[PDB]
Amino acid sequence: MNTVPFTSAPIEVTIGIDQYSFNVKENQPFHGIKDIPIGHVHVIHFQHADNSSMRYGYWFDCRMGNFYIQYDPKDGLYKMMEERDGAKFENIVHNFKERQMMVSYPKIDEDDTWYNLTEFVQMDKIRKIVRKDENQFSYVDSSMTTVQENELSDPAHSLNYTVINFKSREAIRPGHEMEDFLDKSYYLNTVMLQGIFKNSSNYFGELQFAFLNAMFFGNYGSSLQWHAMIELICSSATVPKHMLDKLDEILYYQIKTLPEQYSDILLNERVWNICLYSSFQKNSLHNTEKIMENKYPELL
Amino acid sequence: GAMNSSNYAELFNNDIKLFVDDTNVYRVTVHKTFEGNVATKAINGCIFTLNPKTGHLFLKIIHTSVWAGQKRLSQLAKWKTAEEVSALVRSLPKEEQPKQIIVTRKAMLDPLEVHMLDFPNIAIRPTELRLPFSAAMSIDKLSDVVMKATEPQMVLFNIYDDWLDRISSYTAFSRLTLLLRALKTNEESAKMILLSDPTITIKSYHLWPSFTDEQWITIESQMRDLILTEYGRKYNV
Secondary structure (H helix, E strand, O other): OOEEOOOOOOOOOOEEEOEEEEEOOOOOOOOEEEOOHHHHHOOEEEEEOOOOOOOEEEOOHHOOEEEEEEEEEEOOEEEEEEOOOOHHHHHHHHHHHHHHOEEEOOOOOOOOOHHHOOOOOOOHHHHHHOOOOOOEEEEOOOOEEHHHHHHHHOOOOOOOOOOOOOOOOOOOOOHHHHHHHHHHHHHHOOOOOOOOHHHHEEEEHHHHHHHHHHHHHOOOOHHHOOOOOOHHHHHHOOOOOHHHHHHHHHHHHEEEHOOOHHHHOOOOHHHHHHHHHHOOOOHHHHHHHHHHHOOOOOOO | OOEEEHHHHHHHHHEEEEEOOOOOOOOEEEEEEOOOOEEEEEEEEEEEOOOOHHHHHHEHHHHHHHHHOOHHHHHHHHHHHHHHHHHHHOOOHHOOOOOOOOOOHHHHHHHHHOOOOOOOEEEEEEEOOOOOOOHHHHHHHHHHHHHOOOOOOOEEEEEOOOOOHHHOOOHHHHHHHHHHHHHHHOHHHHHHHHOOOOOOOOOOOOOOOOHHHHHHHHHHHHHHHHHHHHHHHHHHH
C-alpha cells in the first residue's frame, strides 16, 4: 500500500483520486492520500473552489517512484513531484500518518471498478501519449487538445492519441473503396491492431485512457478519441471473439461509472445508436446495451 | 459549403466545376413473377456529369451487366457512380480537372469523398437546389444512346448545343434547367412544345431544336406556363 503525501493545501480545492474525491478547505491540514492500491495506474486530480474551469490532474504509478503534491503559488496549481531521497520520503510519510493527516484510499473490497476501468492502461503507454519524459507521471487538464484536433497549436502540450480517420488513405485501400468504408475490418485488424497497436491490449488501453480523461477532466478530444475507437471496432464485420467480449465488459464499467448528469456531452448519440443498433456488432455488446437502455434511454 | 441560391453565380466563374447527378444510374422496371411475386428488371442507366459553364456533358453509360450478381444495388450504384466520376477525373489532363464537384444528392458525398481521396484539393460539395437533372432521359438523343448501348461507354455531348455563341453560361444554364424542369413535370406537354413545328429541326450534332432568338422566347414562355399550370393541379391552388 502506497502513499502520496501533500506538503500543504493552501487553497480550497476538490481533490480526486481515481473515482473518489474530497473537499479540502483553504489551509486545512490535509497532507496526503494513503493506502493507494499497488498494481494499477492512478490519477490524482484537482478542481479549485474558485475556478470550476480547468480540471487538472496527474497519472502515476507508485511502483515507478515516490511522488508527492505541492502547491505552487506562482503557477497557481497543485504540482506532482518526485522525491528521490527514499529515506527523506518514508520520513515525511511516517510522520504525517502518525499525526493522521491523511485520508485512506477508500476501496470497498468487493469493488473491482478501478481495476475494470484501467485493466489495459499501462503507465509506459500513457507517457507516450503525454510526452514529458523528465517526469515519471503525466499531467492532463480540461483544455489540452489532441494531435488530430491540432491538424484541423502548441505540440509540447498535446495528447498524442493515435489518429483514426475513416475517410483517409490509411483507412481505405485503393480498389477496396466501398468494401473498406462499409467494413472497417482491414483498417482495424491489419492497420491498427497488427500495425500500430501491435495487440488488442494496447488498443483497449488507449481507449480506456481516453474515456478516463474525458470523464475526469471533461477533455473533449479524449471523448472524440474514445468514441472513434469504439466505432472502429463496431464497424468491422470481422473482430476476434475475445476482443468483442472484453469490449462489452470495458464499456459496461465505463457507462456504469459515468456521472448521470454528464451523459449529454460525454456520450455521442450517433456512435452509440450505430454501435448498439446498426453496426456489425449490434448483438455483441449485450451488457453495454442493457445498461445503456436502463440508464440513458433518452439518448437512444 | 452547400450550393444554394445565394452563391448561384459561382457556377459561371472560371473555376472548373462539375455537377454529378446519379438519379438515372440504377434504373429498373418492377413486374410480377409467375408465382405472383414482385421482381425488378434493370435497364441501362447513365451518370450525368456536366460542366455548367461550358455545357460539356460526360454521359457515362451504366450497362446492366454491372449489376450482375450484386446485392444492395441502390447502395452500390452510389459507389459505382463515385468510381466512374473519379476515373473521369483521373483521365482528364491536370489543367482540366475540376476544382469542385457538386453532387445533386447528398448520399453521394461519402462515396465520392472516399473515391476522391487521391484528389484532396478537389472540394466535394452538396447543393440545396432542386435541380431537374433526372429528366435527362427525357432528352430523346440521350435516352436513345443509353438504351442502345451493349457495353459500358462514355458519350460526350454539349448540352447547350451552340447557344453560348449567343448567350452567357448563366442564361444557358437557366434555359437548360427550365427545359428540364418542364420535361420533369409533364414530359408529354414539354415535348409537344418543342416539336410542334415541323419546320424547326434538331441538327444531327445537337440535342435541341434550332430555335431563333425570338422563337426561344416563345418556347421559354410556354415552358413557364406549363410548369405553373402543373403546380396548381398538384396542390389545388
